[PDB]
Design brief:
Interacts with IRS1 and IRS2. Interacts (via bromo domain) with acetylated lysine residues on histone H1.4, histone H3 and H4 (in vitro). It comes from Homo sapiens (Human). Helices cover 65% and strands 0% of the residues. It contains five helices and no strands. The longest helix has 32 residues. The N and C termini lie close together (12 Å). It binds 3-methylthiophene-2-carboxylic acid. 3-methylthiophene-2-carboxylic acid binds next to helix 4 and helix 5.
Length: 119
C-alpha cells in the first residue's frame, strides 16, 4: 500500500529498457534531419530520455501518466513506419511487449494503494 512506490519502480523499469538493444532508436528524439517528413506524420514526438527526465523532475503525478507517454512512443513508431515488417517498428513491438509485461504490476499496486488510502 505504498502510494509513492511506483516512482522508483518506474525508474528501474526505465533502466532495464535503456539496457535493451531494442530501445536504441527510442532513447532520444527521432532525428528530424534523417527523417525530414517525421513531423508531417507525427503530432507529438516522445522518447525514453524525455519520459525519464519528466519522471525525475517530479512532473508525473501517477504511473498512469508515465504509461500514456511510453505508449505514445510505441503508437508514433506504428504510425511512422512505412511497413509493419520494418526493422525499427519490429524493435518497438518487442519493447512494447516487454514494457506492458512489467508495467502491469506497477499500475495494479499503485491503484491498490490509492483504494486502501480512500478506505
Ligand atoms: C523512427 C522510425 C524510422 C523509420 S520507422 C521508425 C519508427 O519509429 O517506427
Amino acid at each position: 500500500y505504498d502510494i509513492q512506490a511506483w516512482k522508483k519502480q518506474c525508474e528501474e523499469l526505465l533502466n532495464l529498457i535503456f539496457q535493451c538493444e531494442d530501445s536504441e532508436p527510442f532513447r532520444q528524439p527521432v532525428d528530424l534531419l534523417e527523417y525530414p517528413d517525421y513531423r508531417d506524420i507525427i503530432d507529438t514526438p516522445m522518447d525514453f530520455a524525455t519520459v525519464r527526465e519528466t519522471l525525475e523532475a517530479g512532473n508525473y503525478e501517477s504511473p498512469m501518466e508515465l504509461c500514456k507517454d511510453v505508449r505514445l512512443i510505441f503508437s508514433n513508431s506504428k504510425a511512422y513506419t512505412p511497413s509493419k515488417r520494418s526493422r525499427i517498428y519490429s524493435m518497438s513491438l518487442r519493447l512494447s511487449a516487454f514494457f506492458e509485461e512489467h508495467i502491469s504490476s506497477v499500475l495494479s499496486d499503485y491503484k491498490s494503494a490509492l483504494r486502501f488510502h480512500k478506505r
